Design a protein around this ligand. Structure first.
Ligand SMILES: O=C(O)c1cc(Br)ccc1N[C@@H]1CCCNC1
Ligand SMILES: O=C(O)c1cc(Br)ccc1N[C@@H]1CCCNC1
Lengths: 157, 156
């Protein structure tokens, strides 16, 4: 129904969505300002690593700093095939996408990195309170020339 | 408008199927394949090989739940959160999962992971289920050495 509360919810959902879209389409130099889409105490980072522990960057300044490292390590990164999922929580979105670009990590040769990604975005007062990325670390190993372990699955149909 | 009332109906029905899927345990896992369409696809989208292990069709889903009940004999999903989307036929689930892993040729272990699941529906049944996790936790549960990525310059 058309109550003012459901209008507020819809309003917020619409503003939050535009922030998700902006985050996902940010490229090149503007990547250095993306930290401004987060709350002061916002957290962003990679939730699927080889260690099994999240790489979580806490706070806007730290996100700012890490965006510099990221521009060096992924100089031409683009997100593609982007699909945004709104949820029953107007402050929570998921995104399913791909990504591609050069990977330049010290200690390895320069490679082409492609992966499939899920992102979680949680909001608070119109800014990102928590962003989390989920991907398959095995595709990153390949991109870096690191040997991928294989599971035998004997007697799988 | 009854378009939105059909949609809301579709969403609430599909959501109960997602709940049932997620809370199925023990022997009832032999019958979960019945929640799928006949042509339905289920499986693991994050593998070491980079290709999905997709199990196509209701009958095959059934047979692969037999294998799965030997490999993961006491598996349970926990800390379940269901996300509805703007599409009444598309849901996401964030959860944990754990239990014994018992694969041929590897030492028995205890597997635990963090999981995302995508469920897409058709006529109130599951047309496509996809699981996404971190394969490195599965390696670890199997005694398989996990390489370490060096991230130099990484700040704090
Ligand atoms: O793209 C950015 O500006 C960026 C900023 C921060 Br801060 C952390 C990582 C970033 N990019 C990586 C590229 C490879 C896939 N994961 C995300
Ligand atoms: O739990 C089931 O009944 C099941 C049925 C099918 Br057919 C395939 C895999 C199954 N379970 C595993 C548990 C370990 C984490 N990924 C999914």
């Amino acid at each position: 129904e058309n109550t003012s509360e459901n209008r507020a919810q819809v309003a917020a959902r619409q503003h939050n969505r535009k922030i998700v879209e902006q985050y996902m389409h940010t490229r090149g130099e503007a990547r250095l300002k993306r930290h401004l889409l987060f709350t002061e105490d916002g957290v962003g980072g990679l939730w699927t690593t080889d260690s099994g522990q999240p790489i979580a960057i806490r706070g806007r300044e730290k996100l700012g700093e890490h965006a510099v490292w990221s521009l060096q390590c992924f100089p031409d990164w683009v997100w593609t095939d982007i699909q945004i999922f709104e949820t029953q929580d107007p402050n929570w979105f998921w995104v399913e996408c791909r990504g591609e670009g050069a990977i330049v990590f010290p200690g390895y040769p320069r490679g082409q990195y492609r992966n499939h990604f899920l992102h979680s975005f949680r909001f608070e007062n119109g800014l990102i309170k928590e962003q989390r990325e989920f991907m398959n670390p095995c595709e990153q190993f390949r991109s870096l020339g690191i040997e991928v372990p294989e599971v035998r699955r004997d007697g799988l149909p």
